[PDB]
Amino acid sequence: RIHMVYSKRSGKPRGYAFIEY
């Protein structure tokens, strides 16, 4: 499950919200 394709797994505001979340 991904949010978009930002940079990494845990990315506190942006790269977080469905990649790690």
UniProtKB/Swiss-Prot annotation:
Protein name per its UniProtKB record: U1 small nuclear ribonucleoprotein 70 kDa
Residue range from the parent sequence: 131 to 151 of 437
PTM (free text): The N-terminus is blocked. Extensively phosphorylated on serine residues in the C-terminal region.
Further information: Major ribonucleoprotein antigen recognized by the sera from patients with autoimmune diseases, such as systemic lupus erythematosus.
Superkingdom as given in the UniProt entry: Eukaryota
Function, in words: Component of the spliceosomal U1 snRNP, which is essential for recognition of the pre-mRNA 5' splice-site and the subsequent assembly of the spliceosome. SNRNP70 binds to the loop I region of U1-snRNA.
Record note on quaternary structure: Component of the U1 snRNP. The U1 snRNP is composed of the U1 snRNA and the 7 core Sm proteins SNRPB, SNRPD1, SNRPD2, SNRPD3, SNRPE, SNRPF and SNRPG that assemble in a heptameric protein ring on the Sm site of the small nuclear RNA to form the core snRNP, and at least three U1 snRNP-specific proteins SNRNP70/U1-70K, SNRPA/U1-A and SNRPC/U1-C. Interacts with SCNM1. Found in a pre-mRNA splicing complex with SFRS4, SFRS5, SNRNP70, SNRPA1, SRRM1 and SRRM2. Found in a pre-mRNA exonic splicing enhancer (ESE) complex with SNRNP70, SNRPA1, SRRM1 and TRA2B/SFRS10.
Compartment(s): Nucleus speckle; Nucleus, Nucleoplasm
Domains (record comment): The RRM domain mediates interaction with U1 RNA.
Gene name of this polypeptide: SNRNP70
